[PDB]
Amino acid sequence: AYGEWPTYLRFYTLKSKKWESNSTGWWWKLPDALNYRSGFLCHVQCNATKFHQGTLLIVAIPEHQIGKKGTGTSASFAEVMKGAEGGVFEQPYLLDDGTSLACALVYPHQWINLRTNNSATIVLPWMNSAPMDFALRHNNWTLAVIPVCPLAGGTGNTNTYVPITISIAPMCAEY
């Protein structure tokens, strides 16, 4: 991994996302999710009971320009800004960047496989080529989470909503 302790130069807990067997995947942009030269760390776990099956790829991508199908037109405000509410992957297989999901492991990646572990954690040291970004209008890292294999197990009333809980701390943040 990137080998920094979270460094410069209290956690926040987002509302749990209701995963399903069909779900494409979710992302958040940092700092946007906090609402700043910082070492963000991200700590994500499943509320999944032991019968359940399926698996998530957890990735943090630097400078992730979300692309789109079918137009040369650049993304609007509301498409890229999502706060803690987060955004969907319209095409997980292209990671929206026209790049293979299969190769996303070049970025710092962790697996939630429901046999081995329902929890994963990543340190996101500051990557910006300016020393302390200060405006509200850029996101150095994107935390992304994708169902590599579809959620399964249970019956009837259990309704396959098996939640993901995401947690974030801007550890060693200075202003």
């Binding site: 999944a48 249970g154 939640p163």
Partner: protein, 39 residues
């Protein structure tokens, strides 16, 4: 508050329950007597 919803297997019902309990700590002190109103 239910930050997630609950998750349980097919063999166990949603009749799941929390118990709440309390005490004072070692640092506690009570100042001056006045007889209780409950009896």
């Amino acid at each position: 508050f239910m930050q997630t919803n609950l998750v349980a297997p097919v063999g166990a019902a949603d009749q799941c329950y929390i118990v709440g309990m309390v005490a004072a700590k070692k640092d506690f002190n009570l100042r001056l007597m006045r007889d209780s109103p409950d009896i």
